[PDB]
Design a protein around this ligand. Sequence first.
Ligand SMILES: *[C@H](O)c1c(CO)cnc(C)c1O
Ligand SMILES: *[C@H](O)c1c(CO)cnc(C)c1O
Lengths: 269, 264
Amino acid sequence: GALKKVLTIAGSDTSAGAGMQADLKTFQELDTYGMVALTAIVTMDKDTWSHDVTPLPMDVFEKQLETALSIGPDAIKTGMLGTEEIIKRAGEVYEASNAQYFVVDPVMVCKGNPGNTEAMIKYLLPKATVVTPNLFEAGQLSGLGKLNSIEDMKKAATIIFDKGAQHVIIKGGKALDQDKSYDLYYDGQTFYQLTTDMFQYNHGAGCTFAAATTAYLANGKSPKEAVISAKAFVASAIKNGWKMNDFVGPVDHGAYNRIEHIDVEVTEV
Amino acid sequence: GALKKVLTIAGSDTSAGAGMQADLKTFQELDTYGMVALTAIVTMDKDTWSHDVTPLPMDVFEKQLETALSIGPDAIKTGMLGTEEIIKRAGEVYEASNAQYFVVDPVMVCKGENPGNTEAMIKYLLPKATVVTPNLFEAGQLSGLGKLNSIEDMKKAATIIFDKGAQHVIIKGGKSYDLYYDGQTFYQLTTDMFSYNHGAGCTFAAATTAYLANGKSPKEAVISAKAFVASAIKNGWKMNDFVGPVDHGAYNRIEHIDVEVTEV
Ligand SMILES: *[C@H](O)c1c(CO)cnc(C)c1O
Ligand SMILES: *[C@H](O)c1c(CO)cnc(C)c1O
């Protein structure tokens, strides 16, 4: 039947591994109609790879929103938002829409502000179907600071959930363990640990995971299935990522469908 | 082997049917690594679908090109360029890269809705173009023939545009004829006729570009891109009362449509 319409409110990653590029790519891979409202443009210097974030004026941000909103998204994802104004508006449009799914990837960092954090806490967490911080973002969102363990991650998730998020996944990434990738998923009742092997290039892993979750929810998976299916999606992308230069390599967003499925072990902790 | 890297220099079609959205989606469908240097942001009024083109500052345009060029595209496509200076830089970045394929979709109009720009395309892009993909209006402008009303006028247009330096020319007729010309032979490309065609041209040029990057001859790339876009068109859907985009994934997901090829 008709493609589900999935909007991302996000920034452009010129390198095309992350940000709106990941979102659109992943939305397409998962057979949904992808759309974007750009908040910012990120570029990288040719010699050093230093990032430059160029914000987009609010008037064009709002023009993009009006269009994308008239089209009627079934699910919304947010990525790099950049300002409290934008953060606040991202929240407002979700509520104003007929969308049933709101996936918040609380971007703070790229590979290669309590201000925005508080605005994220205030305006986004209470409407979030799923929120997907990495280890660093989870400690900020929870106000616990540096999380060192599965049990600290459990603490962070309860705190974030109690601030309004219906479902929380914290990516433990290379910080928690480096032989295995652990994420902690929490739904208010039970803590699930999600585990896959590690092999290697993971630029855009985060966005891709949040983008896949949104598509999976748009297409009818429960948040649990959606998160688990997204972890598998991104694990394959990560395994088959490629070297772009001396600083970075993107995930291969098409790997799950074109190369292989990777097993995600799920356990209660 | 590694994913081929394909750059599009284009604008954002907020409706996500055409422009860079169509490009990236098409690029992804054809197993290539798609990238974009954004030239502008196109938005549409909710009530009238009036297009508003917000250009991006030239400084951010150039920072995006610097990053895309360091990554090293295997192929470059152009879409909406908007100014004669954007037109010139697009050609220059093609020449500066090690890219072997330059596909120019000389966009002048959008589904739903400067001859100085037309002159700029003729001077800067056409001499570098592996493939140029005008619709009927754009071909009449690039050729200077004005409104093309027949396969004879299209043949003339294609000859003129080839003579301006484009190596392969396809004029989309808009039954369902496209005219392909390589300098030696005129091939009429046809399928059955199917109105949710928003982004068909971008998708066609984007698929052409990916096919070329993945090793198909220009003839085969065009024929393959036509089948690709025909499926997308056939499976387009109604977005609102003004427009309906093509289904970029329809070739892979839904069905494969045969292209009839005939010399003319
Ligand atoms: C950074 O690379 C990045 C992210 C996080 O990976 C999200 N969005 C944009 C535009 C980025 O550049
Ligand atoms: C128009 O919708 C359009 C075209 C031509 O189809 C190309 N690029 C952009 C950004 C557009 O909006």
